[PDB]
Design a protein around this nucleic acid. Structure first.
Length: 183
DNA sequence: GCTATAAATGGGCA
DNA sequence: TGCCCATTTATAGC
């Protein structure tokens, strides 16, 4: 399953769900305490809960974004809590089309990387402009996953909708990181 | 904190 | 017609 012997740690999950009922954001921001609505800046009510530690963006359309959870289950669970709070506030909220939209993972290969050599050998996939951002941007095609590679050996993997894509992206890159280990 | 990465949502605006 | 708007999270160097 994880030939490298390293398993990327899931750090952030963004999911979305349709409450399937229009919402009065101004009424939600007044009644709810764990909220903050400033439409001139963003069209959403920003709500937060302690467990699972997450943040929700609630829109008048009934659409909702859930960010911050450390697992897919935690995300859905948190999304359900927001929906219940909305329901309790007075709206006929449902839990329609729950979908995991992005999973962010990270791991440490515990060895330094020669980013410039890696970038040069994989120019079709890399973007390494150290003066702007210190990490190399590797946009993997299969699976379609973006990996941020640092000299420290620390790797961030994002864009996955299924955790196995995160795991696969890593396993695919491992041999490449090894080939360019900084000695 | 800013730089960069992915993803979803929306109001505004050239 | 597209783009930033704000939110989250790991990462590291101004």
């Amino acid at each position: 399953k994880h030939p490298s012997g390293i398993v990327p740690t899931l750090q952030n999950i963004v999911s979305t769900v349709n409450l399937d009922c229009k919402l009065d954001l101004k009424a939600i921001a007044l009644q709810a305490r764990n909220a903050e609505y400033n439409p001139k800046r963003f069209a959403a009510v920003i709500m937060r809960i302690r467990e699972p530690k997450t943040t929700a963006l609630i829109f008048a359309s009934g659409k909702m974004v859930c960010t911050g959870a450390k697992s897919e289950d935690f995300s859905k669970m948190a999304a359900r809590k927001y929906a219940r709070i909305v329901q309790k506030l007075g709206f006929p909220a449902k839990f329609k089309d729950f979908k995991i939209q992005n999973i962010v993972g990270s791991c440490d290969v515990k060895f330094p990387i020669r980013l410039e050599g890696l970038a040069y050998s994989h120019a079709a996939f890399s973007s390494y402009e150290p003066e702007l951002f210190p990490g190399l941007i590797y946009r993997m095609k299969v699976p379609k996953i973006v990996l941020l590679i640092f000299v420290s050996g620390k790797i961030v993997i994002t864009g996955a909708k299924m955790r196995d894509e995160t795991y696969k992206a890593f396993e695919n890159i491992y041999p490449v990181l090894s080939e360019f280990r900084k000695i």
